[PDB]
Every structure is written in structure tokens, then in C-alpha cells.
Specification:
Bound molecules: dodecyl-beta-D-maltoside
Order of helices and strands of chain A: HH
Oligomer: part of a larger assembly
Strand content of chain A: under 5%
Number of strands of chain A: 0
Structural class of chain A: mainly alpha
Number of helices of chain A: 2
Protein name (chain D): Efflux pump membrane transporter
Subcellular location (chain D): Cell inner membrane
PDB class: membrane protein
Radius of gyration of chain A: 23 Å
Distance between the termini of chain A: 76 Å
Family (chain D): Belongs to the resistance-nodulation-cell division (RND) (TC 2.A.6) family.
Keywords: Membrane transporter, Multidrug resistance, membrane protein
Shape of chain A: rod-shaped
Chain lengths: 50, 99, 98, 49, 99
């Protein structure tokens, strides 16, 4: 089966889909949190007295 | 007004005093204009849908270039009647550009 | 390894559907898949050279990764081009004995 | 983008053929020999399952 | 670097610069597109997700090589490019989904 038939014959639909994917990845990049590692340190709470 | 008041305070206040915005002014002063990203993204997405519809990279411009004229017609009505471009007018502009 | 071997097996299957014998199909499938398998292997392997030969920031993770990929890719290529058609033929002959 | 098999060469192809064409024929010769070698090798492998 | 290497491998083996355009475009689309789903799923850019992204370039490159080499093989067998594309995707498009 040729699952690509429509796109092969109408390449601008393929272009548009890829640009949309690309564009939404670009929008998303500066929204992503950024750190060296994922959150792996167990949460902790410190009680201090003197 | 905010820039002017910032200027005033540099001229007027003694060393050791300053101003801080609060309430809605603080939001105005600390918000970016994401409109600079939102508007080009909207135009480009609409262009891409039309490029697919028409199978043409150029025919979408026959639609897109027309919409500034509808916005000008509406804003001309506001200007003529002495209105302003408040948020309700602004949504109306965009719906009229949609139609 | 899976990506490459699925297509060897798929092509052989197609070639049997289009008339060829089990052995002939396996051999022609490998002949057809040889070039893209080797193109990918060469591209990957060349890309591991700056990981192997690069010291500085990130050098430790770069290094362990290049060694792993370089060695793994030699095996991807060789076992994909020689073991897969053997298994293909053995399993085909297993279910079409008589 | 891909042209039919023996299409006339465009400007960048002619430029690459000039600049790099001396690589293509020995590589082509080496791929053909390696390809034929692999074919014989796997063929003998299948006789030694 | 991956894009330069795959371009050179494609030219070395297929000997047309036109075939190298397919990975040239497909690889960055596929890598940059990954961020929108990472964002939607709540992930961060960290040295581990970024490492996965660079390892994944290997799979992305192989995908582009599979498609363009199989089209070009059908062209080497005398098919016109459009028929060669359709035939090539009858051969691999279902397998690509399964893979
Ligand atoms: C970062 C990602 C970027 C990806 C960039 C990809 C660019 C690739 C351009 C693809 C070309 C398709 O773009 C466009 O395709 C359509 C067909 O769909 C062609 O259209 C042609 O065929 C269609 C029928 O399908 C006719 O209706 C049309 O009149 C004719 O021009 C256009 O002439 C071509 O300009
Ligand atoms: C050709 C395109 C390349 C393919 C795309 C692959 C993308 C891979 C991840 C790109 C991520 C960008 O990630 C981004 O990194 C930059 C630079 O370090 C940071 O950006 C920062 O850079 C400098 C100083 O450091 C400042 O002037 C800037 O305003 C600030 O945002 C972003 O806050 C972070 O989100
Ligand atoms: C297109 C193919 C997609 C296949 C993907 C299949 C996904 C499988 C499900 C994995 C589950 C996702 O689960 C998601 O994990 C991330 C891990 O970073 C968690 O992320 C959480 O911790 C991270 C730090 O690492 C912080 O940025 C944040 O405070 C929070 O979002 C999310 O709270 C959780 O919702
Ligand atoms: C031709 C196709 C080739 C396909 C395969 C290519 C795979 C590429 C190899 C992986 C590259 C690794 O890239 C490398 O990643 C690690 C982890 O994110 C980074 O490492 C960074 O994060 C780690 C924490 O994890 C710190 O301890 C380190 O000091 C810092 O440099 C390196 O700065 C970067 O150089
Ligand atoms: C035909 C119909 C038209 C289709 C319309 C398409 C609508 C697409 C809208 C996408 C909007 C999603 O909006 C966004 O959702 C994500 C994921 O749930 C939320 O979550 C995101 O940021 C939060 C922090 O704020 C973190 O948990 C994480 O990094 C990320 O998941 C965001 O806070 C929200 O801004
Ligand atoms: C994690 C959940 C996943 C569960 C579901 C996974 C399903 C994967 C389906 C992908 C298959 C689609 O791909 C399609 O496969 C079928 C066989 O199945 C191939 O079909 C081929 O073999 C069949 C017999 O098996 C013949 O009738 C036919 O002449 C030939 O084309 C198609 O050429 C290919 O295009």
C-alpha cells in the first residue's frame, strides 16, 4: 500500500504539515524548563532551632 | 506616562529614594509584548492553511493582503466618531478581518 | 538493528509473494538492502569520530557514547547483513517443510 | 526534486562532477566489487546454516 | 555535523545533490518538531533529554536514507521520478509505520 500517495501527488500538503510541525517545535523551545538534570532529588524540609 | 514618571523620579528624588510601580502599572512594567510573536505566528499559520487549500505559495496573498483594508475601515469609523481603540474595539477589528 | 532487519525481512516476504523461492528471495532482499544499510552505517560511524577524538567540556559522556555507538554499529551492519537472511530462511523452511 | 535516470546535468551537478568526479568512479568500482563479494559471501553463509 | 555527513554519504553513493535535500530538510524538521510534544508532556530541556535527542538523530537519518535511497533505486531501474516515488512508498510506507 502507498500511504504516501496523496502527499506525493500534492507535495504542498506535505510541505505545510512539516512546516507546522517545525513551527510548533520552535514555539515550544523557549517555553521549556531548563536544568542540568530532571527532578530526582527527594524533597526535603529543614526545621531549624537555636 | 510611565516613562515620563520614571524620568521625573530620576530628576527629582534624592539618592536613596526611588519609585516602584504597583497594581496594574507593575503588570504593565513587567509584562513583555508577546504580540510580537503571536501576530506573525497567526499570519503564518493562516498563510499555510491557505497554501494547502489553493496548492499555491502565492494565491494566499490575494486574501491576506485584503484584511488591512477592513481594519482601516472600522478604525476610520472610530476616528470619525471620536472613539478609542479599547479592547472591545480590538476584538471587533479581528472578527471583522475574519469575516 | 530492528529498523534494518524488518525491511530485509519485508522485502524477502514480498519477493516470495511475487514468485521467488525462499532462498532466492532472502538473497535478493539482502542485495536490495545492502546499500542503504551501509549508507546509514557509514554516516553513523563517521559521526562517532568527533565523540571519540574530542576532549574538553562534555568529553567523558561524548567518549563513552562514541565507543558504544561505533562498536554497536559494526555489529548492526554485519549481523544484519548475514544473520537475518539465515534466520529468515530457517524459519521459512521450518513452516514449509513438506 | 530527483531527475530521471540519465537527465542532462544541471549546473551544481556539473560543478560536483568537476570538483569531485575523480572520487566517483573508483568508489563506484569498489562498491560494485564489494557488493558482488557480499553476495557470494552471504550465499555461502546460507549453505552453512 | 549529522546533516553534513548524511549529505556527503548521499552524494557519494547516489551521486546526485538532489537526493541530499531530502535528509537536509527532514532531519532538522524531525529534531525541532520533537520539542512541541516534549513541551506538552511536561518535560524539560536537560542534559539527559538533550542527549536522547542527539542519539535519536541516528534513527531520523536512517529514515531519510531509507526513503531517498529506495526512490533513487527505482529511478536507477528506469522509472520516472513520480512513478519511482509511488513504487518506492508501496515498498516501504507500511513498513515505516510498523517500524
Ligand atoms: C522547514 C520545513 C520546510 C519544508 C519545505 C518544503 C518545500 C517544498 C515545496 C514543495 C512543493 C509543493 O509546493 C507546491 O506544490 C503544489 C502541488 O501540491 C504545486 O502545484 C501544482 O500542482 C497542483 C496540483 O497538485 C496544481 O493545482 C497547481 O496549479 C500546480 O502549480 C506547486 O507548484 C508547488 O509550488
Ligand atoms: C539551526 C537551529 C538548530 C536546531 C535546533 C536545535 C535546538 C536545540 C535546543 C535549542 C534550545 C535553546 O535553548 C536556549 O538556550 C539559550 C542559549 O544558551 C538560552 O538563551 C539565553 O541566551 C543568552 C545568554 O545565555 C541571552 O542573550 C538570551 O536572551 C537567553 O535566553 C535559552 O534560555 C534556552 O532556552
Ligand atoms: C509521540 C510519541 C509519544 C510517546 C510518549 C509516551 C510518554 C510516556 C508517558 C511518560 C509520562 C510523562 O510524565 C511526565 O513526566 C515528566 C518527567 O519529566 C514530569 O515532569 C515533572 O518534573 C519535571 C522535572 O523532571 C519538571 O519539569 C516539572 O515540575 C514536572 O512536569 C511530569 O509531571 C509527568 O507528567
Ligand atoms: C551521524 C549520526 C550519529 C548518530 C549518533 C550521534 C550521537 C551523538 C553523541 C552524543 C553526544 C553527547 O553530547 C554530549 O552530551 C552530554 C550530555 O548531554 C553533554 O554533557 C554535559 O552534561 C553533563 C551532565 O549530563 C555534564 O556532566 C557535562 O560536563 C556537560 O558537558 C556534553 O556537553 C555533550 O557534548
Ligand atoms: C481545530 C481546533 C484548534 C486547535 C487548537 C489548538 C490548541 C492548542 C493549545 C495548546 C495550549 C496548551 O497550553 C499549555 O498547556 C501546557 C500543557 O498542558 C501547560 O503546561 C506547560 O507548562 C507548565 C507550567 O506552566 C508545566 O507543567 C510544563 O512545562 C508544560 O506542560 C501550560 O501551562 C499551558 O500554557
Ligand atoms: C502497538 C500496537 C500495534 C498493533 C498493530 C500493528 C500493525 C502494523 C501495521 C503496519 C502494516 C501496514 O503495512 C502493510 O502491511 C501489509 C501486510 O500487513 C503489506 O501487505 C503485503 O503483504 C500482504 C500479505 O501479508 C499481501 O496481501 C500484499 O500483497 C502485500 O502488500 C503492505 O504492503 C504494507 O503496506
Amino acid at each position: 500500500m502507498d500511504f504516501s500517495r496523496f502527499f506525493i501527488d500534492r507535495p504542498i500538503f506535505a510541505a505545510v504539515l512539516s512546516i507546522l510541525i517545525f513551527i510548533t517545535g520552535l514555539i515550544a523551545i523557549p517555553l521549556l524548563p531548563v536544568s542540568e538534570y530532571p527532578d530526582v532529588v527527594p524533597p526535603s524540609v529543614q526545621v531549624r532551632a537555636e | 506616562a510611565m516613562t515620563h514618571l520614571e524620568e521625573l523620579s530620576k530628576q527629582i528624588l534624592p539618592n536613596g529614594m526611588n519609585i516602584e510601580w504597583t497594581d496594574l502599572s507593575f503588570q504593565q512594567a513587567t509584562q513583555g509584548n508577546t504580540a510580537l510573536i503571536v501576530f506573525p505566528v497567526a499570519v503564518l499559520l493562516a498563510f499555510l492553511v491557505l497554501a494547502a487549500l489553493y496548492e499555491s505559495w502565492t494565491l494566499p496573498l490575494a486574501v491576506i493582503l485584503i484584511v488591512p483594508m477592513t481594519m482601516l475601515s472600522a478604525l476610520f469609523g472610530v476616528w470619525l466618531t471620536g472613539g478609542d481603540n479599547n479592547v472591545f474595539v480590538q476584538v471587533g477589528l479581528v472578527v471583522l478581518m475574519g469575516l | 538493528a530492528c529498523k534494518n532487519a524488518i525491511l530485509i525481512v519485508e522485502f524477502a516476504r514480498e519477493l516470495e509473494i511475487q514468485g521467488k523461492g525462499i532462498m532466492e528471495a532472502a538473497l535478493e532482499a539482502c542485495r536490495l538492502r545492502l546499500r542503504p544499510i551501509v549508507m546509514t552505517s557509514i554516516a553513523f560511524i563517521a559521526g562517532t569520530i568527533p565523540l571519540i577524538l574530542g576532549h574538553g567540556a562534555g568529553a567523558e559522556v561524548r567518549g563513552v557514547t562514541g565507543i558504544t555507538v561505533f562498536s554497536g554499529m559494526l555489529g548492526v551492519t554485519l549481523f544484519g547483513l548475514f544473520l537475518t537472511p539465515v534466520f529468515y530462511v530457517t524459519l521459512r523452511k521450518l513452516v514449509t517443510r513438506r | 526534486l530527483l531527475k530521471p535516470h540519465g537527465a542532462k546535468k544541471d549546473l551544481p551537478t556539473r560543478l560536483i562532477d568537476r570538483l569531485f568526479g575523480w572520487i566517483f568512479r573508483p568508489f563506484n568500482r569498489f562498491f560494485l566489487r564489494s557488493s558482488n563479494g557480499y553476495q557470494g559471501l552471504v550465499s555461502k553463509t546460507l549453505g552453512r546454516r | 555535523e549529522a546533516v553534513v555527513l548524511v549529505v556527503l554519504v548521499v552524494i557519494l553513493f547516489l551521486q546526485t545533490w538532489r537526493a541530499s535535500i531530502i535528509p537536509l530538510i527532514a532531519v532538522p524538521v524531525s529534531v525541532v518538531g520533537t520539542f512541541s510534544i516534549l513541551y506538552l508532556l511536561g518535560f524539560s530541556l536537560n542534559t539527559l533529554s538533550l542527549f536522547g535527542l542527539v542519539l535519536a538523530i541516528g534513527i531520523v537519518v536512517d529514515d531519510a536514507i531509507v526513503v531517498v535511497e529506495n526512490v533513487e533505486r527505482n529511478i536507477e531501474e528506469g522509472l520516472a521520478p513520480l512513478a519511482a516515488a509511488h513504487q518506492a512508498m508501496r515498498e516501504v510506507s507500511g513498513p515505516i509505520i510498523a517500524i
